[PDB]
Amino acid sequence: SNAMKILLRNALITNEGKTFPGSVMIDGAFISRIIEGELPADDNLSADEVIECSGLRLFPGCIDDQVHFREPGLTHKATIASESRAAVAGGVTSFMDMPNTNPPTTMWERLLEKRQIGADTAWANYGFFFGGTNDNIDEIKRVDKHLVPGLKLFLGSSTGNMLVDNKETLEKIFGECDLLIATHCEKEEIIRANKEHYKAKYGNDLDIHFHPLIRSEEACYRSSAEAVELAERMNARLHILHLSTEKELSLFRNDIPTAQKRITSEVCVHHLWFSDTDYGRLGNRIKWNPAIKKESDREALRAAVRNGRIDIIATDHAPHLLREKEGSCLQAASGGPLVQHSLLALLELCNQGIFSIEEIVSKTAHIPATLFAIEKRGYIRPGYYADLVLVDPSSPHTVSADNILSLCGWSPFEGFTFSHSVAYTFVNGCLAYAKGRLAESRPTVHPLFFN
């Protein structure tokens, strides 16, 4: 735990739509003061410790609503320890891990178990979505809603147990369960029709370029449209994950603020960064579900971040070993790591005018905290937890085998040089990462607290 008063002195702060020179005083685990302007040379406000931040940008730490840290049961790929270290190195100070582990997080015992793993091993603050299945409605009703961000349903991509296809079950969940429902929307019936066409016409060895043709725009839109109708029918709280298409944007609104919406959306950095033009170069290293699709889709998603149709930005960090990423679009695993570099990638798009720094902070910190009703995080406000990231906009960072932290040991950004680097990351006032190196000691971490 931190017990010291630590002054982050003369940073360029971005918070709540404003960017301004200022200093932030940390007192133990909390932000105690924000001091606008440039403190004169001699003035350290009686801090116990000072970090000189001139030239650095200071943001609230990113809060990521969708990661897959592969624990329990898939730990050859990753662990909560390994990936939360990668997260802090990327300026992500809170994460929400998904229930598709082995065993899946579909009963209360499993959720409590993951919370203990977090307490014992995470380097960032932690939360865990509860999983819905065709068979666990009774478990869902007994979920303490303070202890999870919501319920995750896989309406596609998943198989058997984790695939919620039972229509009576979906109606029952939406109509009976009082929590936020996050959905993965791809219509498997459409994907299968497309798979049949492409296999019949082009054969069994279909490469990556068939991936967005099989897991098509219409397969995403049809699933999302059906989820939206069901949520409207029940006045349910629905949060559609990882939007990948322009077409889906018509299902969302930007006439009201996120806090008022019953139906919200998330986009992930890879869908904001990559397009299908990148398949030639990167191949399976950018194979994801939902698939990376057209340049025009990427353009529409960027616009929707700016206009508000997309509520938040996340990663869908989902490591696999490279031996699992091998083969055809039918054999290779979908998913890859992103959390160590996603903030740098967003900041690179800000250098290009695609987003403002203010929007990126809103979408990665402010709005995730608002949307999931997370207590005392996501904002640089007095009394909030000191989850903070300092970035250096004039110190490039090149991604290499040597500096990748994810256990899987590769990155879709391998070889890329970002203009920005992460200079420092604080988690609950504990310095967790500084100048390319994880701290000697794990920071104090907490479960995220919801409502």
Ligand X SMILES: C[As](C)(=O)[O-]
Residues tagged active-site: 316
Rg (CA), the chain: 21
CB 248, min distance to Zn ion, A: 14
Q: Is 70 a binder of Zn ion (CB under 5 A)?
A: no
Q: What's the gap between Cα 92 and its chain centre?
A: 9
Which partner in ligand X, Cl ion, Zn ion, none is near 94 (CB below 5 to 8 A by kind)? none
Quote the least distance from Cβ 24 to ligand X, whole Å.
15
Continuous segment of H or E residues that includes residue 263: strand 263-268
Cα 409 to chain centroid distance, Å, stands at: 19
* Whole-number Å distance between alpha carbons of 130 and 150: 6
- 335, two tokens: 């998913």
Residues 316 to 375: which contact Zn ion by CB under 5 A?
A: 316
Closest CA to 212 of 154, 158, 276: 276
* Position among 99, 127, 212, 337 found at the interface with Cl ion (CB under 5 A): 337
Q: Provide the binding-site residues for ligand X, judged by CB under 6 A.
A: 41, 54, 68, 100, 154, 157-158, 184, 289, 318, 334
Q: How far is the CB of 168 from ligand X (least distance, A)?
A: 22
* Closer CB to ligand X, 336 or 429, in the complex: 336
Applying CB under 5 A, among 270, 341, 363, 366 the residue interacting with Cl ion is: 341
CB of 307 to ligand X, least distance (A): 26
Of residues 61, 39, 59, 60, the one with CA closest to residue 50:
39
Q: Which of 5-13, 30-38, 338-346, 421-429 is the region at the interface with Cl ion (rule: CB under 5 A)?
A: 338-346
**Smallest distance from ligand X to CB 244, Å:** 12
What pairing do the DSSP bridges indicate for beta strands 388-392 and 421-427?
A: antiparallel
- The DSSP 8-state label assigned to residue 310 in this structure reads S
- Contact partner, 337, from Zn ion, Cl ion, ligand X, none, Cβ < 5-8 Å per class: Cl ion
Largest CA distance in the chain: 75
Residue 54 touches which of Zn ion, Cl ion, ligand X, none (Cβ within 5-8 Å per kind): ligand X
Instruction: Give me the phi and psi of 259, to 5 degrees please.
Output: -55, -25
Binds Zn ion by CB under 5 A, chosen from 152, 184, 215, 287: 184
Residue spans of beta strands (DSSP E) within 16-81: 18-27, 30-36, 49-52, 57-60, 62-67
Q: Which is nearer to ligand X, 41 or 200 (CB)?
A: 41
CA dist 164 and 186 (Å) reads 11
Per-position x/- string for 408-427, each x denoting binding to Cl ion as judged by CB under 5 A, each - no binding: ---x----------------
Q: Is 183 helix (H, G, I), strand (E, B) or coil?
A: strand
Summarize as ranges the residues that interact with Cl ion (CB under 5 A). Answer: 337-338, 340-341, 411
- Where do contacts with Zn ion occur on this chain (CB under 5 A)? 66, 184, 316
